[PDB]
Amino acid sequence: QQSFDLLVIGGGSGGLACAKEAAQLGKKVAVADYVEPSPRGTKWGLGGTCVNVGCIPKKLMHQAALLGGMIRDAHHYGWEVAQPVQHNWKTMAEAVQNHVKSLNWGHRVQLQDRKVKYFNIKASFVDEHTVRGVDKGGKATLLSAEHIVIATGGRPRYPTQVKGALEYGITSDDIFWLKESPGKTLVVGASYVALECAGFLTGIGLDTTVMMRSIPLRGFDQQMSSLVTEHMESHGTQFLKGCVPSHIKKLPTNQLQVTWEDHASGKEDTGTFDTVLWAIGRVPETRTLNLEKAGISTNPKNQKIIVDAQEATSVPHIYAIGDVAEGRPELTPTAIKAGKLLAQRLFGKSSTLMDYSNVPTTVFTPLEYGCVGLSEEEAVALHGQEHVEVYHAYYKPLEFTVADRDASQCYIKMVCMREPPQLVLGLHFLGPNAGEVTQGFALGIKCGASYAQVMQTVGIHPTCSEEVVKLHISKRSGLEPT
Amino acid sequence: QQSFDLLVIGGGSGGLACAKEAAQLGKKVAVADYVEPSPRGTKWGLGGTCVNVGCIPKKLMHQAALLGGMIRDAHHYGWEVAQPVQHNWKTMAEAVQNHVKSLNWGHRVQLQDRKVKYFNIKASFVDEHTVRGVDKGGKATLLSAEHIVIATGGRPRYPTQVKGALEYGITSDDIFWLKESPGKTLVVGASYVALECAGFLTGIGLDTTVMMRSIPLRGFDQQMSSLVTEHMESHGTQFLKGCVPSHIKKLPTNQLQVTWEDHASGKEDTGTFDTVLWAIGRVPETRTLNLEKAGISTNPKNQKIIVDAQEATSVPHIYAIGDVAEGRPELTPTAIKAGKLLAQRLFGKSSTLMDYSNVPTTVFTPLEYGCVGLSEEEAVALHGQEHVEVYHAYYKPLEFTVADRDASQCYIKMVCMREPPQLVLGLHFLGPNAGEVTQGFALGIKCGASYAQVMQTVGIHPTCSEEVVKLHISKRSGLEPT
Ligand SMILES: Cc1cc2nc3c(=O)[nH]c(=O)nc-3n(C[C@H](O)[C@H](O)[C@H](O)COP(=O)(O)OP(=O)(O)OC[C@H]3O[C@@H](n4cnc5c(N)ncnc54)[C@H](O)[C@@H]3O)c2cc1C
Numbered sequence A, B: 001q002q003s004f005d006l007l008v009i010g011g012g013s014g015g016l017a018c019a020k021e022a023a024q025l026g027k028k029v030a031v032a033d034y035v036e037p038s039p040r041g042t043k044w045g046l047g048g049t050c051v052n053v054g055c056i057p058k059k060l061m062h063q064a065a066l067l068g069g070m071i072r073d074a075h076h077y078g079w080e081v082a083q084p085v086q087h088n089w090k091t092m093a094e095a096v097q098n099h100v101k102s103l104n105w106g107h108r109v110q111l112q113d114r115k116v117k118y119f120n121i122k123a124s125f126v127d128e129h130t131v132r133g134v135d136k137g138g139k140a141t142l143l144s145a146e147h148i149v150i151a152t153g154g155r156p157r158y159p160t161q162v163k164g165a166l167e168y169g170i171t172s173d174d175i176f177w178l179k180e181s182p183g184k185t186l187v188v189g190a191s192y193v194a195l196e197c198a199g200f201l202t203g204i205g206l207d208t209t210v211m212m213r214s215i216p217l218r219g220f221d222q223q224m225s226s227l228v229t230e231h232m233e234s235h236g237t238q239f240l241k242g243c244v245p246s247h248i249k250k251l252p253t254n255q256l257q258v259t260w261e262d263h264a265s266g267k268e269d270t271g272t273f274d275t276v277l278w279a280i281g282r283v284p285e286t287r288t289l290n291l292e293k294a295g296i297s298t299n300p301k302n303q304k305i306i307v308d309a310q311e312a313t314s315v316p317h318i319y320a321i322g323d324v325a326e327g328r329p330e331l332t333p334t335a336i337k338a339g340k341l342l343a344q345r346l347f348g349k350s351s352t353l354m355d356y357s358n359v360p361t362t363v364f365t366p367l368e369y370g371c372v373g374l375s376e377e378e379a380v381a382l383h384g385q386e387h388v389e390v391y392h393a394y395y396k397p398l399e400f401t402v403a404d405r406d407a408s409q410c411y412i413k414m415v416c417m418r419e420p421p422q423l424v425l426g427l428h429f430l431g432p433n434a435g436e437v438t439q440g441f442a443l444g445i446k447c448g449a450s451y452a453q454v455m456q457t458v459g460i461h462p463t464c465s466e467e468v469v470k471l472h473i474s475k476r477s478g479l480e481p482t
């Protein structure tokens, strides 16, 4: 159609927030969002990855597996539930998918009510102020605007040089939509996406195995990541440490013949699974954009979009947000706010910039891992072991006592500066409702909380989070942390 | 026996902490703890109210009822659990009680290892440096010490002028130990003790009714308390608003004939219940102390012990801690720390005082209510409506969506100062894992967090606590909070 004050490419977490805000600021906004299906042929509605194949489905299926543990615990507190309790993938999927759809329609209604022309068209630049797009039936349509915002996020990544890879494998995109149970599954990866999925899969009774080339959750505090995987294998998830896939052969039975190199024992083993999921990192969606045709530089290694402290780029009126923006953390909350504030800066008269420092997060694994601030190792790198004090503790959730469920791995460590009052650099929590616990402490770090203040902060008894506040044993002291 | 550097009357939350610390400071400590049974004849081990008839049993039975909701939700996520699932009080009680005992022995072992002579003797003063006590078989025993610490807490309170009261009623002390299901129960009270108990009782399938003379949770933010009870009656708990008991008659069937005045409708109705629990406030245990024989002044109204900012009293070497200390909040964490720090001050060389300001708390009702800082109403009283801004929101836990369980009452309000950056005065959370959520924010308030900082604090998605950080709609604005 004609032009708009603002045009947003990608109707997901970041983009939709930018549009809705701009639209709320009395500006004529337009958004184009197209869901190029997955190799396996999966596709979905408006809302981006988080809504359709990310946070939501993941968290809800995790909730499913958790409930399974809840039913065991149930009998300990007096609930005479017939223990031989099966779980069927169809019901769960049905339920999760329907909610996902509520969000699709929920967004369209929000875009309609704020009046934002929605073009389900996959964009690509032609010049510096215009884009061209195709649709379901494939037909061009001229679109331009003064300001443009790229919020195209990314997509899973397939392995290079692995026959059978595309032809038979599936990704995080396909799993939340499978029509029938994945049956026996092999998850290839060490990212949080990998761990979380094998986790709830194990939770719902599936034979699951994680294949890791090297270390777990690269990027996160290693001691905690270590504790996470240890909890997993101690509770059903099978692990293939130090292994890489080389090829997959489908059997006349339709099963998958996964062959691999085991760099930690022999040198090549093989297994048979019903599903093989590749969780090996994502790739920014810039390929199709023709960013070159618009003069928007991007960093070579990670095909992201180089950006300003104002999410700006090569061109002064073109901005990048979310998974595509280099440096920016791949989280839904940051993209939402970043884009929302960007709208505020453009036609809202605000001068506030997005602040990606100390962003709390939580990996939703069987035993949840929530953290905010510096990694221990990360802390000594910036200050030196000499100026860092680390308080830690193994604790036991009251609820775990009567349910008689293992408390190992329920560990908490708080990284502070050694000199008083000892500013807190990072907090790490491993246990039930980790995200629920970490959140509040994030405000503590954004405010500059100190260990001195932590000690003067009474706990809510009885709870797991109070343990965070009861921490007194440093690692330097050498004392037993239990 | 002979004297000790420190003598502690009452081996519970506050006292045991004081002793263990003093004992750890190389001082010879002694503690006397006697559990004068309840009118109904219930009694227990070392550890105080929290361990035996408070936080622990309460929280675990609450956990029981919660699991019941968890089993319903279970079917929605695909868990084919045979819905007609009964719950039996015997198993639960057995399980909860055994854990309670672990704490009894757990404490004795800690007192043995730190070497603290334990005299299961109910004390009473004779002079200013000595006490006299009786035991199981009742036999005196001379005990003195330079410093004395009174940590005798309190005990339930029976109604005055209500025939049938003692003869048939039970208290928070008796419920956690009942040998057989309470059957149909009537809870008389509006304190958190009252609500929490009728709550898990309803949770485990019992016909429960709360009888309230007037308002709920006097002392707490009224809007939130209102929301709490509303959630309860919307989910099984029956309410008798504006009623007072006048007499109880036992029927030849052993049931209880509760007669009462209904100041909100007729003027006198009657009901029949299996159990009647009086949750109408506690009373400090000073009666038996002969505080007069030692010259320790106490405030008339609340028979507590008047104290210094150092938990000191009339006499310079006698200190009071916990439920007996006037002004001090009746919580386990405060008593623990207060007593621990007191030890640090005496023979530890510390000059730090206990800080009872902004203590977070959480009432464990069907739908949990966690809060810290000022009550809204409390805030306008100290600053004036004119200088207070209140942000609020109704939200829906992701997990509630697929389980299809009502989100009403899931409300969050944050009371701040109106002038920027808008210091936060109090935070109120109503929903799942309230204590888990509130804790962290307590550190935020102890640090002086501001709403400006709250807005710059990214949330962990998806979680309930992130809602706390997403708050943007003020009450002044008049806008819809959903
Ligand atoms: C398995 C998994 C689990 C996750 N769990 C969490 C979690 O618990 N918490 C959390 O905070 N984050 C989580 N994330 C990450 C989160 O979903 C992303 O950080 C967030 O979606 C990024 O937002 P975005 O707006 O940048 O892009 P996206 O939400 O990915 O949206 C981009 C949109 O643009 C479309 N598009 C792409 N190219 C074009 C084009 N050329 N033309 C038109 N449209 C185009 C896409 O198809 C899509 O609809 C998870 C991710 C995965 C994969």
Ligand SMILES: Cc1cc2nc3c(=O)[nH]c(=O)nc-3n(C[C@H](O)[C@H](O)[C@H](O)COP(=O)(O)OP(=O)(O)OC[C@H]3O[C@@H](n4cnc5c(N)ncnc54)[C@H](O)[C@@H]3O)c2cc1C
Binding pocket: A460, A461, A462, B009, B010, B011, B012, B013, B014, B015, B032, B033, B034, B035, B036, B047, B048, B049, B050, B051, B053, B054, B055, B056, B058, B059, B121, B122, B123, B124, B151, B152, B153, B154, B172, B193, B285, B288, B289, B321, B322, B323, B324, B329, B330, B331, B332, B333, B335
């Ligand atoms: C139903 C209920 C639920 C609760 N839930 C919570 C909760 O979730 N969280 C929380 O933080 N708090 C909770 N509390 C309150 C908490 O238990 C108290 O605040 C805490 O126990 C007070 O500690 P204390 O050391 O002062 O006294 P107590 O723990 O009460 O200990 C006093 C001890 O001294 C003994 N004693 C008394 N008089 C004498 C004497 N003359 N000679 C010798 N010994 C004597 C007593 O028998 C007892 O063993 C709850 C209370 C109740 C009643």
